[PDB]
Amino acid sequence: TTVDFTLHKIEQTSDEQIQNTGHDLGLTGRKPVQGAQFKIFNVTDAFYQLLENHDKTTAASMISQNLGQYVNLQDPNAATVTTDADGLAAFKGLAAKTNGRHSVYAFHEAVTPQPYQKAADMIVSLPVRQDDGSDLTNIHLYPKDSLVTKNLTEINEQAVATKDLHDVAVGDVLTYQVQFQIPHDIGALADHSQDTFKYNQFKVLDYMTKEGLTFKALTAITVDGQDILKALTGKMAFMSSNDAAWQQTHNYPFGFELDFLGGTDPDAVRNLLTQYAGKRVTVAYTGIVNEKMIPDQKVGNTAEVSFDPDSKITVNGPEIQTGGIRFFAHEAGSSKSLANATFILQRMNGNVREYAVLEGVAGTYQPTKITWTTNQDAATRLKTSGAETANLTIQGLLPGRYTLVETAAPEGYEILDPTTDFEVIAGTWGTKTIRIANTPV
């Protein structure tokens, strides 16, 4: 006589010990995960052999921690079903008894879809008996895939609503957070080994291919509501785009590589991680938007979590972008470029005028920060070049409505209109280059 196992693969974004009854839980209202490949193994003999020296709990635990020690994982006979769009994968018609004992079955996620981490290898020992004193013939399991994620969480230390695209100003500090799971078997030894651990690399690589950000700081590493970073530092390996090391191995203009087990004392780290095994880690860091952040340029990041050199779990973060504007100061009635025309940048703030002060500083302004004052004389005086198509450029601005105010015409000219109202368009230089005419004398 036989038994069926129907699996319900589901997404996990937090810590959650919830027990498998084996009973059908119906509409649980949880996101299913598709494309998880599961293999099943009869471990009844191996289990009962352990059961001579160890209790029931310890036996099942030993098999979970090193399933490939007790079975040939790449067995062609081993029944394999892949999880569908509802997260469903049924293994049917399995022997209820094996060599005179109630059967023990082990389940192993062999291929885990991106960007998930695999479920722990689960062990079921029959029977699973109903409260009416009768065995279940269909056993329902809810294995969990932990979702690797990356978000932009704060801008200038204020929480922002999460979205795929953010508008930034030059000199903004951006807080990012990468989340992932400490493996359930982090502290286990390699299958058939007394002298080598199973895990020898727990790496987080995060970078941007395009320019725009300068690495500021790694702010925290937390798990289980505890700050782990103070304990780790020294014992693990760390590189940032600010370190001369970085340009040796990578050529991304921004990023960091962290390895919990690449440091001076791996084993001490593995110990600490084992204490929080199966739980969710948040690695937080900050970056500063720099003068090389340009308009018409969306720039994102990729984070890669890897446990060996040959594999990785990859996730993309949101893209950021910035505004700019171009002007052309010229002689009324022609296209003669007028250099040395003097302007200040204005905006309204609840029916009050503020004027721009640029920290970084031709006609091309590319500041490192823009602050705002109601003292008009403190405003940065902007000068035009003699360039052809546009002779005043500004970038790193938020989108919205501004006013360019001309405070001195070039020698030999007089101002037509002192004020030019305009609009910075999100992530672009704008509709067109704005022409400003000055009349000669």
Residue numbers in the entry: 37 to 397, 401 to 480
Task: Please give me the paper's original passages concerning this structure.
To study the effect of lysine and catalytic glutamate or aspartate on isopeptide bond formation and structural stability, alanine-substituted mutants were prepared. X-ray diffraction data were collected for two mutant proteins (D242A in the M-domain and K365A in the C-domain), and though no isopeptide bonds were present in each, their overall tertiary structures remain unchanged. In the C-domain structure, the observation of continuous electron density between Lys365 and Asn477 confirms that a cis isopeptide bond is present and located in the first (A) and last (G) β-strands of the CnaB fold. Catalytic Glu445 forms a hydrogen bond with the O moiety of the K–N isopeptide bond in a hydrophobic pocket.
